[PDB]
Tab-separated table of C-alpha atoms and ligand atoms in Angstrom:
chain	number	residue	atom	x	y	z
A	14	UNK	CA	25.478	-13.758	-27.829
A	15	UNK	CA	26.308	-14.494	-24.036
A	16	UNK	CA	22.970	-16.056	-22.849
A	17	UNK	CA	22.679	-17.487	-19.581
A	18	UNK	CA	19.967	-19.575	-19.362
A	19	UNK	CA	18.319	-19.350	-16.362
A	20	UNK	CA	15.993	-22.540	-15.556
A	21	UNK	CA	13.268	-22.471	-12.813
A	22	UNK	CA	13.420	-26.414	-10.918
A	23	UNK	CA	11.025	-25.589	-7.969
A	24	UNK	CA	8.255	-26.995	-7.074
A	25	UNK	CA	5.406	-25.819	-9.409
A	26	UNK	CA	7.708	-26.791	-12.990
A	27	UNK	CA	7.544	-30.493	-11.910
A	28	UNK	CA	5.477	-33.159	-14.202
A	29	UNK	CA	4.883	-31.793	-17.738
A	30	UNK	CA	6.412	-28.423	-17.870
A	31	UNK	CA	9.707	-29.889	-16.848
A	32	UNK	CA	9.957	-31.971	-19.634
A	33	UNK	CA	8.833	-28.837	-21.847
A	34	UNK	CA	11.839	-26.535	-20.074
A	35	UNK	CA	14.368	-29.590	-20.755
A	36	UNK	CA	12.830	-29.675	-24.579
A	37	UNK	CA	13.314	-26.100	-24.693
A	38	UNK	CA	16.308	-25.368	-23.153
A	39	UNK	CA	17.690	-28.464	-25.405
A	40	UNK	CA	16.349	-26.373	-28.249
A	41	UNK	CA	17.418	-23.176	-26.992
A	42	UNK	CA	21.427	-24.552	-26.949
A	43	UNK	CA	20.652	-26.226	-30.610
A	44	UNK	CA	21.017	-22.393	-31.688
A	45	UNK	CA	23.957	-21.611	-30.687
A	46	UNK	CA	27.373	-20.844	-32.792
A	47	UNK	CA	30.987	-21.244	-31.665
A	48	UNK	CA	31.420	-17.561	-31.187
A	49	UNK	CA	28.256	-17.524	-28.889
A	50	UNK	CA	28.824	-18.458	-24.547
A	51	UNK	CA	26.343	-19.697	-22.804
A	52	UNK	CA	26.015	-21.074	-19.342
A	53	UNK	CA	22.792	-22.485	-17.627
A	54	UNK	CA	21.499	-21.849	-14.351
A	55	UNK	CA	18.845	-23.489	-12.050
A	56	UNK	CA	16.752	-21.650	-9.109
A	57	UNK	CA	15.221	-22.771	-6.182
A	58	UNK	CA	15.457	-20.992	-2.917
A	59	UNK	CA	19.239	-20.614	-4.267
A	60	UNK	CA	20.546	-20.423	-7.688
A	61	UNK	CA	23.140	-22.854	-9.273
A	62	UNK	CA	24.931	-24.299	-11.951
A	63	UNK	CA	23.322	-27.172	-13.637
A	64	UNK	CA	26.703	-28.295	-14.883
A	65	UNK	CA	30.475	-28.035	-13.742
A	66	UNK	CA	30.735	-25.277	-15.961
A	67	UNK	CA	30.793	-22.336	-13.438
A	68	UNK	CA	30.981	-19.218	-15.211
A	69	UNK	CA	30.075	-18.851	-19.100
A	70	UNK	CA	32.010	-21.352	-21.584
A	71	UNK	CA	31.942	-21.344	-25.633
A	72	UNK	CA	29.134	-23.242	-27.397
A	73	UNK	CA	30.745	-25.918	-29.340
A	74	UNK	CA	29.836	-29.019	-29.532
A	75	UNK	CA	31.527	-31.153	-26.255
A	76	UNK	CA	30.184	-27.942	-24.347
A	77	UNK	CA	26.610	-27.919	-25.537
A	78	UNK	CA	26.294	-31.431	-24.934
A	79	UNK	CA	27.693	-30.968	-21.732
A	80	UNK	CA	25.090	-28.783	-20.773
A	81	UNK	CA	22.455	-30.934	-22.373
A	82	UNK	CA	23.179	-33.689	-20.317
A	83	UNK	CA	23.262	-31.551	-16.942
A	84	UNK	CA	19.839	-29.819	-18.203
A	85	UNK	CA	18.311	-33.418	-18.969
A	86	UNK	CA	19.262	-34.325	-15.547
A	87	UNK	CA	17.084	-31.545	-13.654
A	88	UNK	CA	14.764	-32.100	-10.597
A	89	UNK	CA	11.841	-29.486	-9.241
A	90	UNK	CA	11.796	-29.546	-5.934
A	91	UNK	CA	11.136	-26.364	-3.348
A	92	UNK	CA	10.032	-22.613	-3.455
A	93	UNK	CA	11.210	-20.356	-6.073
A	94	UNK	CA	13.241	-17.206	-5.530
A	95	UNK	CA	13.829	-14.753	-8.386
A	96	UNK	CA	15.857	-12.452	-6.536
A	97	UNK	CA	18.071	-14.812	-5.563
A	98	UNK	CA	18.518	-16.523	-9.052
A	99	UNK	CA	18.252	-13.509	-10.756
A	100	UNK	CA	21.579	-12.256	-8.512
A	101	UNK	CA	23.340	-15.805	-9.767
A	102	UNK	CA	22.599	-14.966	-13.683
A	103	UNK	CA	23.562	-11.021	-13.609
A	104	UNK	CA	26.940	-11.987	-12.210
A	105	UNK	CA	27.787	-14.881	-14.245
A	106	UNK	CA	27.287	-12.218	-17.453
A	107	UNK	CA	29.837	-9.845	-15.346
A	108	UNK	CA	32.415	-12.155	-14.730
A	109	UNK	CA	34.863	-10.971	-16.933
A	110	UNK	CA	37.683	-13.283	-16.479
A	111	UNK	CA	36.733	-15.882	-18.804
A	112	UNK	CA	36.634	-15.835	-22.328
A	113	UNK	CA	33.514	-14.333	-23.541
B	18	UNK	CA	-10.967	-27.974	40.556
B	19	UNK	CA	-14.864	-28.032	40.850
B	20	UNK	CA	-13.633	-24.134	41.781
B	21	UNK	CA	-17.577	-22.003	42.205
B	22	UNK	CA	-17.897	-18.497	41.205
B	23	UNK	CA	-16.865	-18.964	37.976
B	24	UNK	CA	-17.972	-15.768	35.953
B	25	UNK	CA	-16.881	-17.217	32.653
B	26	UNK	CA	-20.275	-18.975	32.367
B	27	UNK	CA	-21.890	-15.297	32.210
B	28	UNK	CA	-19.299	-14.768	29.348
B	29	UNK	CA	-20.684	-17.846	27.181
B	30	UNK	CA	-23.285	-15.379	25.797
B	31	UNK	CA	-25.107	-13.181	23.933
B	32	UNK	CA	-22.133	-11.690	21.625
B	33	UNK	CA	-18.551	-13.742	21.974
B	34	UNK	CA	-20.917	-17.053	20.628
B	35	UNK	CA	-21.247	-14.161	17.572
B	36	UNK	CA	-17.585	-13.451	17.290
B	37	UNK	CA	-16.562	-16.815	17.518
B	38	UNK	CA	-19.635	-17.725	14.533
B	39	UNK	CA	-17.015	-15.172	12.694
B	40	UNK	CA	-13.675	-16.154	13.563
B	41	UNK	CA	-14.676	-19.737	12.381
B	42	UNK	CA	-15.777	-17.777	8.466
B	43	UNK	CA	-12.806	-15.846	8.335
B	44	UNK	CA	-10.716	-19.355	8.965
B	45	UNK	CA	-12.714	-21.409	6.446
B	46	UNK	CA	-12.063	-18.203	3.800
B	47	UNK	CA	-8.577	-18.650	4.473
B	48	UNK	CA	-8.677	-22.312	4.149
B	49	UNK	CA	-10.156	-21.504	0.658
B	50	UNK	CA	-7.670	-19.184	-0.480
B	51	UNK	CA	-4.934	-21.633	0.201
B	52	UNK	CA	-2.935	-23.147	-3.218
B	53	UNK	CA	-1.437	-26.578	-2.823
B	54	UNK	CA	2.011	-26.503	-5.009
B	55	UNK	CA	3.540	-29.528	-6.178
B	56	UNK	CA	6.720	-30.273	-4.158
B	57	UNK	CA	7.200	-28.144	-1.245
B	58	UNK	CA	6.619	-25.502	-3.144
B	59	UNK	CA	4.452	-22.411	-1.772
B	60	UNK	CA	2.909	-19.615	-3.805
B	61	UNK	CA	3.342	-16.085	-2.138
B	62	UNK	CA	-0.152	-15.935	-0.718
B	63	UNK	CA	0.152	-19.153	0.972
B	64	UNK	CA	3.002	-18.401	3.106
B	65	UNK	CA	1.362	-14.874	3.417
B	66	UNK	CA	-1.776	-16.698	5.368
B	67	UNK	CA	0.373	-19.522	6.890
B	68	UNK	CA	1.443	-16.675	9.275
B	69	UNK	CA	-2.626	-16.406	10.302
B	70	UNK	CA	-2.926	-19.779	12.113
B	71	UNK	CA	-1.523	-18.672	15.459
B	72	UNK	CA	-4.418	-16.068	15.456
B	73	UNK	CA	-7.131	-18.904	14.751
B	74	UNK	CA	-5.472	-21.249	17.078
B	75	UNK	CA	-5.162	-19.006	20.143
B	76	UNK	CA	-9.183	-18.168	19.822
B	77	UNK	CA	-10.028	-21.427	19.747
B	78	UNK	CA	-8.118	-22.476	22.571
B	79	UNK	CA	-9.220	-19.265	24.380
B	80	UNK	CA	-12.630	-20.844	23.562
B	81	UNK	CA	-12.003	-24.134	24.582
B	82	UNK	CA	-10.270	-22.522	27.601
B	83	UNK	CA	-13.781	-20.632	28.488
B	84	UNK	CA	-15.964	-23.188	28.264
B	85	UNK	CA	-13.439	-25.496	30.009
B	86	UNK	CA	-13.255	-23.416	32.612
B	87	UNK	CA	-17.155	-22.449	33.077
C	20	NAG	C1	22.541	-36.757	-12.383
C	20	NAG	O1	22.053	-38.051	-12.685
C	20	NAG	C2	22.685	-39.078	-11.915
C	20	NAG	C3	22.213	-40.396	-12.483
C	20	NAG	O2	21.153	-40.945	-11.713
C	20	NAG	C4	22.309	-38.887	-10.455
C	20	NAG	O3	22.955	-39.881	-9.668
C	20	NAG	C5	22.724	-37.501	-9.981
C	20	NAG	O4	22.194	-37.277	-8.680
C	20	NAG	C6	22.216	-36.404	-10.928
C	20	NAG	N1	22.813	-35.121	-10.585
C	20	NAG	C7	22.697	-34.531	-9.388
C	20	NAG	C8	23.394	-33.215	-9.236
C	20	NAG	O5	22.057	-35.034	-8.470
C	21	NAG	C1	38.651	-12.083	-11.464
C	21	NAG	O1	39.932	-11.467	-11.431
C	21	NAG	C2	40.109	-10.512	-10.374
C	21	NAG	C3	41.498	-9.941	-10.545
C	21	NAG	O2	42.495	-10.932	-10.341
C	21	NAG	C4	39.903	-11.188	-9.020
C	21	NAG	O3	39.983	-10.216	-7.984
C	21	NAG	C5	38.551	-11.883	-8.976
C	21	NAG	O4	38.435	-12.622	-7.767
C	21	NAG	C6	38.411	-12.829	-10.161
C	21	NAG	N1	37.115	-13.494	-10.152
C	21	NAG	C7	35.940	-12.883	-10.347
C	21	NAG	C8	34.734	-13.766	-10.302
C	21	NAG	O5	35.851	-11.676	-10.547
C	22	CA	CA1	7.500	-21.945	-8.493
């Protein structure tokens, strides 16, 4: 695979359904190989990386727990904006500078 | 400013008590239709009618204006 997982932290995901996106974007890296790059993304009003990881990276282990720790550290707060997110995940998967 | 002739008296009337009896439904439908998001967050709709309260404000102080005035 190359997922990019793209969270939604805005406004309306805070209280229980942020702890269900953490749980399932925790759950969603636990299935992930070492040939498979993934990167997660978070959009509110503007898209970013949840992590210091800006562009896709391998899933191994130091990785995926990197990006478990950024996900687990997530805040909703403001309007959401799928155009502008959606923008941020479409050219993360054409970045083809990176190992992939 | 005790200014006779006023002519706005004649417009507290028959029809624009009628209009304003409808300006004050359309507002409280739009204060129903509004969707309270958790943290600052604002569905479509909502920031569709918060571009409506000019239009409710200016008629009432036209009205308050009026009978000010008269
Ligand atoms: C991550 O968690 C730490 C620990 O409280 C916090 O200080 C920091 O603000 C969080 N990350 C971001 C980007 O704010
Ligand atoms: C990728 O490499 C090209 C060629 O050096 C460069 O122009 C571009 O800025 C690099 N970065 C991205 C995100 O494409
Ligand atoms: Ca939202």
């Amino acid at each position: 695979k190359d997922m990019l997982i793209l969270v939604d932290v805005s406004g309306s995901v805070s209280g229980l359904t942020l702890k269900l996106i953490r749980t399932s974007v925790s759950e969603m890296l636990e299935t992930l190989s070492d040939d498979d790059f993934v990167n997660v993304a978070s959009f509110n009003s503007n898209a970013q990386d949840v992590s210091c990881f800006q562009h896709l990276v391998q899933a191994n282990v130091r990785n995926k727990k990197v990006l478990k720790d950024a996900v687990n550290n997530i805040t909703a707060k403001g309007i959401t904006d799928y155009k502008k997110g959606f923008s941020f995940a479409f050219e993360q998967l054409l970045n083809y500078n990176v190992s992939r | 400013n005790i200014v006779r002739k006023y002519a706005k008296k004649l417009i507290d009337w028959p029809p624009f008590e009628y209009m304003i009896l409808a300006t004050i439904i359309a507002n409280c439908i739009v204060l129903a239709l509004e969707q309270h998001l958790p943290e600052d967050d604002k569905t479509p709709m909502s920031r569709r009618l918060e571009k409506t309260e000019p239009y409710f404000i200016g008629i009432f102080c036209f009205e308050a204006g009026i009978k000010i005035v008269a």
